[PDB]
Structure formats: structure tokens, C-alpha cells
Amino acid sequence: REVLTGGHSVSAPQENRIYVMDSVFMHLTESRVHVYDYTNGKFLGMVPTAFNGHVQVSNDGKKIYTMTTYHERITRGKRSDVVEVWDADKLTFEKEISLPPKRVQGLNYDGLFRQTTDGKFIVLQNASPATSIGIVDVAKGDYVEDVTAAAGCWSVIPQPNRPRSFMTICGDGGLLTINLGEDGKVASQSRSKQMFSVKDDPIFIAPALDKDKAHFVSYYGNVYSADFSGDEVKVDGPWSLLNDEDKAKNWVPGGYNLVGLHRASGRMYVFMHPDGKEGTHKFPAAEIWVMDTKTKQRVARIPGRDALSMTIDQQRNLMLTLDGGNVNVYDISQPEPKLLRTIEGAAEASLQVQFHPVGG
Amino acid sequence: EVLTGGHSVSAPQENRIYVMDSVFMHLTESRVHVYDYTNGKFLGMVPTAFNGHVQVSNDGKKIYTMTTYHERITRGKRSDVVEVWDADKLTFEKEISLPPKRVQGLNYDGLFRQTTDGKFIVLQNASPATSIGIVDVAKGDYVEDVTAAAGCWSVIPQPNRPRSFMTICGDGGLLTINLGEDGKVASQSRSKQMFSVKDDPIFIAPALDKDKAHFVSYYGNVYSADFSGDEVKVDGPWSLLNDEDKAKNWVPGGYNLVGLHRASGRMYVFMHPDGKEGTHKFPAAEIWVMDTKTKQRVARIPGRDALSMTIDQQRNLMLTLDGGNVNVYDISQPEPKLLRTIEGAAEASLQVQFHPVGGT
Amino acid sequence: SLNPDLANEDEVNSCDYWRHCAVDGFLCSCCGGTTTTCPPGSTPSPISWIGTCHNPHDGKDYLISYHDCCGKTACGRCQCNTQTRERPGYEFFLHNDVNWCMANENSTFHCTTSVLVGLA
Amino acid sequence: EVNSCDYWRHCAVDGFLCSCCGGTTTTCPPGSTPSPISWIGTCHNPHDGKDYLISYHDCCGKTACGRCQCNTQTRERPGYEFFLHNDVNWCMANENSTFHCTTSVLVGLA
Ligand SMILES: *[NH2+]CCc1ccccc1
Numbered sequence: 040r041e042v043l044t045g046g047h048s049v050s051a052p053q054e055n056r057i058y059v060m061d062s063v064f065m066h067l068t069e070s071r072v073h074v075y076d077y078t079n080g081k082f083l084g085m086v087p088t089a090f091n092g093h094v095q096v097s098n099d100g101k102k103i104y105t106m107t108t109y110h111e112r113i114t115r116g117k118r119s120d121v122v123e124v125w126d127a128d129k130l131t132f133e134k135e136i137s138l139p140p141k142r143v144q145g146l147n148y149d150g151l152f153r154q155t156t157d158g159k160f161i162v163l164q165n166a167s168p169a170t171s172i173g174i175v176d177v178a179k180g181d182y183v184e185d186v187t188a189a190a191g192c193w194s195v196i197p198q199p200n201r202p203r204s205f206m207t208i209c210g211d212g213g214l215l216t217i218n219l220g221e222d223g224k225v226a227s228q229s230r231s232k233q234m235f236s237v238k239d240d241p242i243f244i245a246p247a248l249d250k251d252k253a254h255f256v257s258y259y260g261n262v263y264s265a266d267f268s269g270d271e272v273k274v275d276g277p278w279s280l281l282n283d284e285d286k287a288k289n290w291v292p293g294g295y296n297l298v299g300l301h302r303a304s305g306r307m308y309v310f311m312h313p314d315g316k317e318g319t320h321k322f323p324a325a326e327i328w329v330m331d332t333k334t335k336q337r338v339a340r341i342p343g344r345d346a347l348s349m350t351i352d353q354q355r356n357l358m359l360t361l362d363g364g365n366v367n368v369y370d371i372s373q374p375e376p377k378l379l380r381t382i383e384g385a386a387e388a389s390l391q392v393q394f395h396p397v398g399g
Numbered sequence: 400e401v402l403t404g405g406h407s408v409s410a411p412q413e414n415r416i417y418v419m420d421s422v423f424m425h426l427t428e429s430r431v432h433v434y435d436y437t438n439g440k441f442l443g444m445v446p447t448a449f450n451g452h453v454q455v456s457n458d459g460k461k462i463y464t465m466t467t468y469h470e471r472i473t474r475g476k477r478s479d480v481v482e483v484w485d486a487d488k489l490t491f492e493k494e495i496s497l498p499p500k501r502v503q504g505l506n507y508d509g510l511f512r513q514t515t516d517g518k519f520i521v522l523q524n525a526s527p528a529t530s531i532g533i534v535d536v537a538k539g540d541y542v543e544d545v546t547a548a549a550g551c552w553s554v555i556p557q558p559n560r561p562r563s564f565m566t567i568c569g570d571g572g573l574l575t576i577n578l579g580e581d582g583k584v585a586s587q588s589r590s591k592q593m594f595s596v597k598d599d600p601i602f603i604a605p606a607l608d609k610d611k612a613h614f615v616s617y618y619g620n621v622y623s624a625d626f627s628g629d630e631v632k633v634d635g636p637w638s639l640l641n642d643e644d645k646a647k648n649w650v651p652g653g654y655n656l657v658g659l660h661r662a663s664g665r666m667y668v669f670m671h672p673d674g675k676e677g678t679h680k681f682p683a684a685e686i687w688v689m690d691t692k693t694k695q696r697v698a699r700i701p702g703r704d705a706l707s708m709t710i711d712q713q714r715n716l717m718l719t720l721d722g723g724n725v726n727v728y729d730i731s732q733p734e735p736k737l738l739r740t741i742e743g744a745a746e747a748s749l750q751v752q753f754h755p756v757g758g759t
Numbered sequence: 760s761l762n763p764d765l766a767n768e769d770e771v772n773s774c775d776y777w778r779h780c781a782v783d784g785f786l787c788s789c790c791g792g793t794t795t796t797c798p799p800g801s802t803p804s805p806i807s808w809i810g811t812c813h814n815p816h817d818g819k820d821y822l823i824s825y826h827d828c829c830g831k832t833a834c835g836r837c838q839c840n841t842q843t844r845e846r847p848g849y850e851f852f853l854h855n856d857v858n859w860c861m862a863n864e865n866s867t868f869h870c871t872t873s874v875l876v877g878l879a
Numbered sequence: 880e881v882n883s884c885d886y887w888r889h890c891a892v893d894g895f896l897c898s899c900c901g902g903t904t905t906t907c908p909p910g911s912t913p914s915p916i917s918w919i920g921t922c923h924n925p926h927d928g929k930d931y932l933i934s935y936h937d938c939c940g941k942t943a944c945g946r947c948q949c950n951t952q953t954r955e956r957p958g959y960e961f962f963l964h965n966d967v968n969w970c971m972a973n974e975n976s977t978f979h980c981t982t983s984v985l986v987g988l989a
């Protein structure tokens with residue numbers, strides 16, 4: 040005889056796992072995270088995330104965090120905005136953390152749902168539509184701070200060289216840095232000088248994030264940087280991604296989570312398309328460009344496979360790209376990315392894929 | 400300009416049809432799509448959460464849905480409900496609490512019905528023990544379980560009595576239930592065996608007349624239940640099939656796979672060739688039209704891979720549905736005439752219904 | 760050009776219709792409403808993203824308010840993702856990757872539209 | 880072979896095969912719960928020529944898996960023979976009734 044059993048853990052090691060956040064925009068109340076093995080394309084499991092879920096994996100690899108909204112009767116009744124903590128290996132629900140009813144409802148940019156480098160606090164974007172940043176203490180299972188200093192700013196860029204620090208992009212074209220105390224309350228803050236012109240050269244919010252600096256690309260193909268090796272962030276730019284030939288064909292960036300940095304080499308990866316003009320900033324990639332951030336010059340270009348979003352794994356030297364439904368796995372140990380495989384039908388409507396963390 | 404709400408459906412009731420979209424791929428976001436059958440225009444929709452069922456009140460004023468909620472969708476307390484919606488505004492009015500055992504399953508008509516006088520909603524329960532639930536619409540109350548129907552399935556209202564219905568039982572007979580004015584069972588009766596459950600199982604979908612109902616079997620036989628008198632009189636089988644039909648193994652297949660045009664006595668049935676064990680839900684190769692008086696076939700037309708149908712007595716129409724597309728037929732003469740197809744009416748629907756016109 | 764209710768439905772239900780120039784979502788006019796009326800049983804958002812679209816028919820620029828209708832599940836029809844002059848969330852009211860139903864009594868997103876405010 | 884609707888065991892499956900959903904034919908994907916009740920099929924094994932009883936348990940409490948949808952109907956019967964019937968959610972009695980995927984559990988020879 041056979042017996043059906045539950046209680047099982049994911050069949051593949053953590054190090055093989057990726058997380059495809061499927062918004063299922065056509066039926067956005069049944070968004071979910073699909074868990075895949077990037078080495079062979081196998082579907083490993085999933086986590087339901089109700090209306091417009093967001094997802095991240097804990098820095099220690101042990102837990103999955105989701106953020107979502109419920110109502111008592113879905114389309115009517117009382118609203119509950121929550122963070123949920125799930126076990127990463129069992130893909131089971133463990134804890135709900137109550138949020139104020141203003142968590143960001145929107146497309147899955149990384150910077151809307153992040154955590155401190157030390158993993159002790161979840162850092163999330165609120166919009167009521169007034170903006171602020173919310174802080175959740177994971178251990179306590181509590182919402183502990185509301186950073187109103189961040190009004191008029193958007194998205195969270197953690198600083199990997201500090202335990203509980205992050206930046207946000209503000210309407211003045213500068214960056215606000217927030218350093219949290221060990222209680223999750225703001226311990227200090229600082230504001231940079233203006234980095235970019237909001238009106239003349241808007242940047243994409245997606246950072247190409249190094250340990251001690253972040254690069255940003257603009258609608259017009261320029262690059263800006265924020266160096267946070269010290270307590271005060273130093274900002275610079277623009278330099279152009281484009282040479283004269285590139286300019287002749289109106290190449291510009293486009294996508295959502297559209298950039299990545301390979302920290303060991305300084306290579307930055309950007310989705311690009313020709314015939315850029317007003318309104319093309321979210322167009323699929325015609326190409327992926329590989330930029331040497333030290334020399335400020337392109338080193339390679341490859342077909343983009345209509346990708347919109349990417350993510351990088353530092354330790355295995357991989358880049359994933361995602362066109363909404365399919366995930367492409369690339370080896371980036373050398374300057375030219377090599378396509379290893381495509382996982383077809385990984386999602387119906389995903390703009391975000393993430394690796395399971397292995398760094399700790 | 401100013402965006403306003405509070406508007407009514409743009410086309411009149413007599414133009415409306417209700418396509419129950421299970422959205423099986425995302426079954427927690429099932430819904431009713433309202434269409435105009437005269438021109439294919441989408442008119443509105445009613446959300447119905449997990450595996451909704453739908454009917455329209457006999458008086459045409461309200462839409463009744465049946466669904467299941469949980470406090471957190473995939474966890475938390477279960478609430479099974481009937482909801483009353485206004486037909487013209489497509490707005491929620493009232494929730495009626497059910498015991499947590501309403502039938503979860505595909506959208507056969509007979510799982511969610513009402514008495515002829517429209518005073519009671521009559522629904523199928525399964526815990527998995529089966530019973531029939533009675534809801535008093537005016538009071539907004541669940542009356543009680545008809546436990547006498549244990550071992551039976553589906554609800555066939557008797558259109559010649561105000562609050563009587565039948566159900567098909569595991570002994571191959573019909574149980575008739577007569578409700579009192581309070582919605583409780585006043586009397587009941589069991590017919591003699593109509594069909595052999597082992598040797599000639601019937602499809603549950605009735606071809607329903609004012610005082611009798613016809614049923615088709617897995618092997619192309621027809622049975623009837625006449626409820627013109629005190630007790631149900633049962634008869635059958637007669638075959639849908641001639642020698643040439645039998646030689647090519649023509650059998651019925653579908654879900655809501657039959658209809659009756661009451662004025663003519665024509666029965667409509669989805670059929671396919673090369674019948675064998677396991678083909679009873681195959682899409683229609685053809686629609687056959689039978690004269691139930693003469694017991695002869697009077698037409699056969701292409702099936703358009705249809706699985707479910709419904710008949711409007713008042714306008715002499717038949718709708719068919721293949722899962723996603725609705726076909727509109729004029730059936731005022733023996734050969735049905737195809738008027739139009741409404742493409743993309745649903746992602747996964749096995750049930751379409753007209754808005755009632757008249758019917759007293 | 761300024762009166763969609765007088766135009767051919769196929770024209771207004773298209774993502775290239777001039778006033779739909781920063782729409783992210785399902786056009787309400789395909790969902791049982793019109794360009795300026797929510798489908799039955801869905802509620803207008805009190806807030807919206809905004810921006811200007813050029814009218815090629817009269818050659819003028821117009822201010823558009825992109826309100827959502829809310830409180831019903833996704834319409835699913837006539838999905839557009841046009842981005843003319845759309846900007847990221849640090850210019851929040853020009854941004855269309857957020858749900859402008861976010862402050863409604865029920866935030867479930869149903870459909871979007873493009874409400875004409877006036878000359879730019 | 881097991882992830883195909885033609886696999887001999889799957890002869891009365893209406894749903895998504897759990898073996899395509901991070902589980903196996905006899906194990907629920909992580910975080911989904913077995914149904915204590917099921918519909919039953921009798922399926923023919925093309926290898927040994929024998930018929931076997933299969934218990935079609937669902938895994939429950941997660942939203943639809945969406946992969947390897949099958950709708951096979953060998954010996955399936957309507958709701959008046961309830962435990963042979965597969966147009967109902969066999970998650971109906973679980974703590975959470977949301978349907979995730981369907982398994983094909985070998986009980987034994989017919
Ligand atoms: N106009 C609204 C676009 C949107 C809705 C919901 C979620 C994301 C974006």
C-alpha cells in the first residue's frame with residue numbers, strides 16, 4: 040500500500056533555489072511566489088501571497104518574508120496589511136506581523152520590501168498616498184518605527200557595509216540615509232547633496248549595488264553613483280553608457296529591476312533597447328550591456344531575450360533575467376554572459392526573481 | 400470631466416447572460432462575467448472568491464452567489480455564504496451564513512437552485528456526507544439540512560409546484576421533497592428505480608419541462624420522470640441512437656449537456672463518436688435535436704467543441720459554451736441556426752445562464 | 760477628439776487612443792463602464808496619477824487624471840501599459856506602477872481610465 | 880512519465896498532478912496538507928495487465944499549483960455515486976479547503 044503524507048521539505052538544497060514573484064496581474068488577488076531549482080528548471084513549491092504580494096528571503100536563508108493585503112471578504116470588509124514569516128524549507132506559515140493599512144501596493148521592484156544587512160529588521164515602503172518607510176522587528180514580530188523623514192522619497196537601498204543602514208531616493212534628486220538603532224527606531228540620518236536632476240535626467244530606482252556604493256542608470260542612458268564608504272554619502276555623475284554610435288541609434292535603458300552589479304569585477308549589467316524616446320523606459324531588452332564601472336566603458340553586449348528584470352548571485356557568478364514569464368540563467372564568471380538554460384512558464388506575470396541567499 | 404460610480408448595467412435585462420468563470424487556474428478569484436448576447440459586449444462582473452456558483456432570482460431583480468471565504472484565504476476560519484447582489488447595479492446587498500459544507504465543485508446547474516416561487520434557495524451540501532440546504536431569501540436565514548437526501552445529488556426544481564424539488568439518489572431513483580412555508584420539509588416521496596446506477600448511469604443535468612424531466616445516459620439512452628401527478632412516475636430507457644449511430648459509437652458527453660425547448664418538446668444534447676469508458680465529459684462533436692414525443696432525431700449540427708448549454712424558452716434561444724467562448728443559436732425551428740460567437744467570455748466556464756424574462 | 764462617448768468604441772478601447780498615454784491597467788471602457796464612468800459596482804479612486812497627453816486631432820496638450828475604479832477583482836480586458844512622461848515613485852503623482860486604488864475603502868484594482876482635466 | 884496525464888495511475892485525475900508541483904505521486908508539496916478523503920479510481924496497469932484501486936487524494940491549503948492539469952475520467956461517475964466522482968473538491972473537509980494539486984495513491988489490486 041501507499042499513504043499520502045505531508046510535512047515535507049523542499050527537495051533541492053537552498054543553494055539551488057530561486058523565487059519568482061508571480062503577481063498574476065490578471066487575477067491579482069491570487070499572486071504567489073514560485074520556487075524553482077535554477078540548475079534544472081524543476082518546480083519546487085510555492086507560497087501564496089493574496090493581493091499583490093511582495094517577497095524576500097531572510098539574509099540567513101532560514102525564512103521567507105511576504106508582504107500582502109487581505110480583506111475580510113476580499114473585495115469588501117476590513118483591511119489587514121501584513122508581513123508574514125514562512126519557513127524556507129517547509130514553505131509553511133509561521134507568523135503574521137500587523138502593519139498599518141498603507142503598505143505599498145505596486146509592481147515588484149526590489150526596493151519596496153527589503154531588510155537590514157544584519158537581517159534583524161524588515162524595511163518596507165508605505166504609500167497612503169503620503170510616503171514613509173516602515174520598520175518591522177523580525178524577532179519581536181512587531182512594526183516598530185515609521186520613518187516620516189522619508190516623506191516624498193521612494194524605495195529602500197540597504198547599505199551592505201553597515202548592519203542597519205539604508206538609503207532612499209528623494210524628490211530633491213538626493214538620497215536620505217537612515218541608520219536604525221538596535222531597537223529599530225531611527226538612530227540617525229543624513230541627506231546627500233543632489234545627485235541627479237529629477238526633471239532633466241530621471242534615474243531608474245533599481246540600484247546596481249556594491250558593498251560600499253550604488254550606481255543608478257537614467258532614462259537617457261547616464262550613470263550616477265552614491266558612495267557610502269563614509270557616514271556621509273558622496274554622489275557623482277553623470278557618465279554616459281553611450282558612445283557616439285550608440286547615440287546615433289538612440290539606445291537607452293529600459294525595464295523594471297533592470298540593472299545588476301557583479302561586485303568582484305565591477306561589471307554592471309543593464310537592459311537596453313534602440314530607438315529610445317519618451318515613453319520607452321519600460322520596454323523589454325533588445326540587448327544586455329556589460330559595463331566596466333571602473334573604466335566607464337562597455338565591454339560586451341548580448342541579446343536581451345525581451346527581458347525586463349534581472350538579479351545577480353555574487354558567489355556562483357550568475358545572472359537571472361526575466362521577461363514576465365520565462366527565466367534565463369546566465370553564467371557571468373567571464374565578461375561575456377553565457378546562457379545556460381531558460382525556464383519556460385515560471386510565471387504568468389512576474390517582474391521579480393531572486394536567489395536564495397547563501398552568504399549569511 | 401469627473402469619474403463617477405453608482406451606474407447601472409448599460410444594456411437591458413433581456414439582453415443579459417451570466418458566464419460563470421471558475422478561473423480554475425486561480426480558483427480563489429472566480430467571478431461572474433455579464434455579457435450582452437445580442438452583440439457580445441461585456442457589461443460587468445460579480446466577484447465570487449473561491450469556486451463561486453451563481454443563479455439569478457426568478458423575478459429577475461437579484462443575483463445570488465454561493466462561495467467560500469477564509470480569514471486569510473489559505474488559512475483561518477471558513478465562511479460559506481450565499482450573497483445577494485442587485486442585478487442592475489451589480490452591487491453587494493446581503494450575506495447569508497451557511498454551515499461550512501456547501502458543495503465545492505464544478506458549476507452544474509443543479510448544485511445551486513431555487514424553488515419555483517423563488518422564496519427559497521436550494522443548494523447542495525457535502526461534508527462529504529450529502530444533504531440539501533434551504534435558505535429563506537427574505538429572512539436571510541439558513542433554515543435546515545434536508546438530511547433525507549443523504550446519498551443523493553443535485554437539485555431539480557419542479558416547475559409546476561411552488562416549493563418542491565427532486566434529487567437523484569444512489570438507488571437510481573428520485574427523492575421528491577416538498578417544503579412548507581417555513582422552508583422545512585413538509586413531505587417527501589421516493590420514486591421506483593428509474594435507471595441502473597451500475598449498468599446505465601445518467602448525467603445529472605435534466606432536460607426540464609413544466610411537469611416532467613428527461614435525462615440522458617452514458618450510453619445514449621433517455622429516461623424520464625413525470626411529476627404531473629401525486630407521485631413521480633419514471634420511464635425509460637429509449638435510445639437516442641439508430642443503427643448507424645450505434646455503429647460509430649455515438650454517445651453523449653459534456654457537463655450541463657442538455658436542454659429542452661418546452662413549447663416544441665425538442666431536447667438538445669451534446670454528442671460525440673467513438674464513445675468508450677472515460678469519454679462522458681468529451682466536447683461535443685455535434686449537437687443532436689430530438690423530438691421527445693416521436694423519439695426521433697430531427698437535426699444534427701456541428702458541436703463547436705461545446706461542453707455546456709442553456710435554453711431560453713421566452714426568446715427561443717440556445718447558448719453553448721466550450722470553456723471560453725459562448726455560441727448563440729436561434730432554435731425557433733428544428734434546425735438550430737448559429738447567430739454569433741462571443742470569444743473570450745471566460746477563461747474556464749462550464750456554465751452560462753440567461754437573465755430571466757417572464758417565466759411565471 | 761475630446762468626447763470619447765461620441766467616438767467609435769474600437770478607437771477609445773485602444774491603447775493608442777491619444778488620452779490613454781500613461782495608462783497601466785485595464786481600460787474601464789472595455790469593462791462595462793465608459794472613459795468617465797466606473798463599471799457598475801466599482802468605486803472611483805479619490806486619488807490618481809496624472810500627466811499630459813498630446814491630442815493629434817486638435818494639436819493641443821491636455822492634463823489627464825488616471826483614476827482607477829476599485830473594489831472588484833481585475834477586469835482583465837484591454838490591458839495597456841503606456842508610459843508617456845511617466846516617472847518613478849520619487850515623482851509620485853506621475854507614477855503608474857502603483858495601485859491608485861490604494862486609499863479606497865476596498866483597494867482591489869478593477870480597471871483604470873483617463874479623465875480629461877483641461878488644457879496642459 | 881509520471882508527470883504525464885497518460886501515466887496509467889492517473890486514469891481518473893481532475894486537477895494538477897502533485898508530482899509537477901514540488902511533491903511526488905504520494906507526497907504533498909511542501910506546506911500543502913493531504914485530504915483525509917478522496918475519490919477512488921480503478922486503473923489498468925499496462926505492464927502487469929492487472930487493475931488497481933487508486934485513491935485520488937488532494938493536497939490542500941495552498942492556491943492552485945497550475946501545472947500538469949489532467950481531466951481523465953476512466954470509470955468516473957456522477958455525484959450520486961459520490962466517491963467515484965471527480966468534479967468536486969476532495970479538499971472540501973480540510974481545515975483549509977483551497978485546492979492545490981491531486982495525487983494518485985495506489986491502494987492495491989482491485
Ligand atoms: N493604474 C493602476 C496600475 C496598478 C494597479 C495595481 C497594481 C499595480 C499597478
Ligand SMILES: *[NH2+]CCc1ccccc1
Pocket residue numbers: 450503504505893894937965966967968969978981
Ligand atoms: N480533484 C479535484 C479538483 C477540484 C477542485 C476543485 C473543484 C473541482 C475539482
